[PDB]
Symmetry: D3
Subunit: 144 residues, 6 copies
Amino acid sequence: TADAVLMIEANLDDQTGEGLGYVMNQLLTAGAYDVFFTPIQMKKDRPATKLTVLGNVNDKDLLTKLILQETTTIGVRYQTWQRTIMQRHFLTVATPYGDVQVKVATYQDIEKKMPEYADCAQLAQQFHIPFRTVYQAALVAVDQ
Amino acid sequence: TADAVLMIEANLDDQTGEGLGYVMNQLLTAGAYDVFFTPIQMKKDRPATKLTVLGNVNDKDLLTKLILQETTTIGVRYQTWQRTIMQRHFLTVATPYGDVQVKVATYQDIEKKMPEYADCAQLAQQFHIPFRTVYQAALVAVDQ
Amino acid sequence: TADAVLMIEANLDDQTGEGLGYVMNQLLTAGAYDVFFTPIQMKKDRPATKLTVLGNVNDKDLLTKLILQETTTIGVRYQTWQRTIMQRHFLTVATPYGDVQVKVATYQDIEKKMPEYADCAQLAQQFHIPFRTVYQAALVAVDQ
Amino acid sequence: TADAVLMIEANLDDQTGEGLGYVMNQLLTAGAYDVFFTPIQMKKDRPATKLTVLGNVNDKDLLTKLILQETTTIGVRYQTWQRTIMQRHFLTVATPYGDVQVKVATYQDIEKKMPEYADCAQLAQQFHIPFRTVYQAALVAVDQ
Amino acid sequence: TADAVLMIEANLDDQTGEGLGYVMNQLLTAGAYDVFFTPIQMKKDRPATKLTVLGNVNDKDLLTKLILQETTTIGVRYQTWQRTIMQRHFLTVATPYGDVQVKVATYQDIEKKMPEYADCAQLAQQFHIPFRTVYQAALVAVDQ
Amino acid sequence: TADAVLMIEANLDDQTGEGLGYVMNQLLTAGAYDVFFTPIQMKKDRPATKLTVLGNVNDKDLLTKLILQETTTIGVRYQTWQRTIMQRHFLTVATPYGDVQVKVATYQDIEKKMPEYADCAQLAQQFHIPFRTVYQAALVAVDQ
Ligand code: NI
Ligand code: NI
Ligand code: NI
Ligand code: NI
Ligand code: NI
Ligand code: NI
Ligand code: NI
Ligand code: NI
Ligand code: NI
Ligand code: NI
Ligand code: NI
Ligand code: NI
């Protein structure tokens, strides 16, 4: 329910998008909770990318050294955030195209249901039907 | 003058812009100081949107549960920032097209004046003249 | 008046921000009407930049060769747009800090006035006052 | 069906966000098919906005004059695009919270169904439930 | 060489990021030359995404139907651009970690050399060294 | 090695890009470690810009008053981050076009080398060769 997460940030104005795509794959393999890019504008007319890494506070040394080894940045900044997390468990639901795992997130009186992307995309590809069609079929099917 | 604000963030890769526009209206109604979207790029080629909520630190539970109920996110992250705020009071100034309320923000020796958008937009619409024309008329008129 | 303008675009996922600042400076010196960057998202999790150059139709070969020379792109795409341009004339107005050229743009029933950035920024730095202060003083002086 | 659409663009580095919200509201009221903002980066370290307006070819003069009147741009560029449009029909479906219009779009072998945002947002506010709850109920009701 | 390229665009304010990653993967598999996302801002406070697809002029119907099938858009807009393409040839160079193909692009007086990302990323992972290390080694080896 | 940095942020929806470019130049002159813009979307259909300032924690008063004097914002938010910084020293390396200073950043076992943009851009301009060509020549030359 209650948690803390480390946020690590770096401003990269001398890194290519190809190399940035490479480092995001490296950071997820290293176990980061999340990684995202933000387009930013830096001095001297430089379109840059901000790299943000979320992870366990005890992975600070791991994720820092990864960033310092694989990107061009001279330094990183990091800070601890708090987190409020819903409770998760999974349901298998039968849809017109097969079973789809549905994520049931709960927090006190709040309950919502999210079909898992992976199941829906695999069924959309196999039966040559749209992703949104399989996803919406799972939503209807989770009504009971 | 001195203050603190809570920042709540969430990365939404499975939420539509229509639904995001809906939640920003909900968050302002709930009394958030500010809400803004940042376009971000997440794993698996997902163009995502970061939702940032600013508000009173005592509204953490209110704004969290709102986000957890109305968006698709499983968790939120939050942290406390400090704030330095200028002093505000309002002046009514007479322009060629009517009275326009002007915000006078002061901080120590710093003084600046901002015509209120709402008055300027209403007068621009009624008299079928550009917004920037009414706004600039208010700026000239605040010189005395 | 009426015109036609060439638009050249390239999607750059293998370019650093440092190099992009260089090519924009190169292209404006060579006479592009305008150059701008658009953050885009490309394949393989790449935060990329779209380079757009606007310029004279007869300068197509110059600006193309410049992009192919200075960026990593293998190709450029281009198309001609039509343009509608306002008529310009300039007012020099006397302020507390010096003369400021004011651009007066007209189109049919449209008349608008923009103090020139170069004048305002130079006098703000030279007289050690905010930019907004010189900008607003020119507006006041264009009242007559 | 087949169509042609006018695209008008302008790069605005001398416009506030407040004024841009005003002109988008002005242009949609005047009958633009659509208006959107794109964040771009311009010369002299300027975070700018590209304004794009889509509209009827015969409305070119109206939308141009509107942009030249309400923004700071000296010119606009425009070009005509071709369009491929799906065929529309609407289903009104009965939900636990009222009727919801469902847009059924078809193209060759394509059939897709989108609950109308206006219906879902209005019933969610009126019945004090999440938007997603009304949206999903319409999906369930379109199962028949 | 000279070419012409089809550009197809759609403004998506009712699409999730998960679904957008799916359609970009679908469109590249179907033979689009390129697909990219642009963050845009639409009406009713909607953070949206513009989908742009570049492709062969004769593939217009395939890519259109794909977009109409997999996204929520009711229509697409398209136009043909001209293209200027550099001439390509490839150098395979021997590095400390294996062979790396180097793309040598030429145009009039222009000669530039780009190590192939696929080669560099594969050898960096296989030999457990940074990407930059394999990239720079190919540059060194292309010195002869 | 270990450090702390102050982050100051402000959301500007009533500031022009020209004025924002002006303030970024002012903030770097005042000694900020870094300044960047992030495009954001705020309420009432406003494309806005987030201004982020990084600097020494003891420059809080300096950088705040600068922002409050030169922009339109009523308040700033700020927080302290931690930093991990690599060790820096400079090498002059001989390339085919002159000496180029190369930044050698080290952190424990990590060593990487970055040619300084300023030297590479000056040599590219003087000899009328691409930036990337001089930068890559410096990379090859730093191999010994
Ligand atoms: Ni089963
Ligand atoms: Ni009065
Ligand atoms: Ni590439
Ligand atoms: Ni020329
Ligand atoms: Ni001086
Ligand atoms: Ni300007
Ligand atoms: Ni009309
Ligand atoms: Ni009620
Ligand atoms: Ni819609
Ligand atoms: Ni084909
Ligand atoms: Ni291995
Ligand atoms: Ni020397």
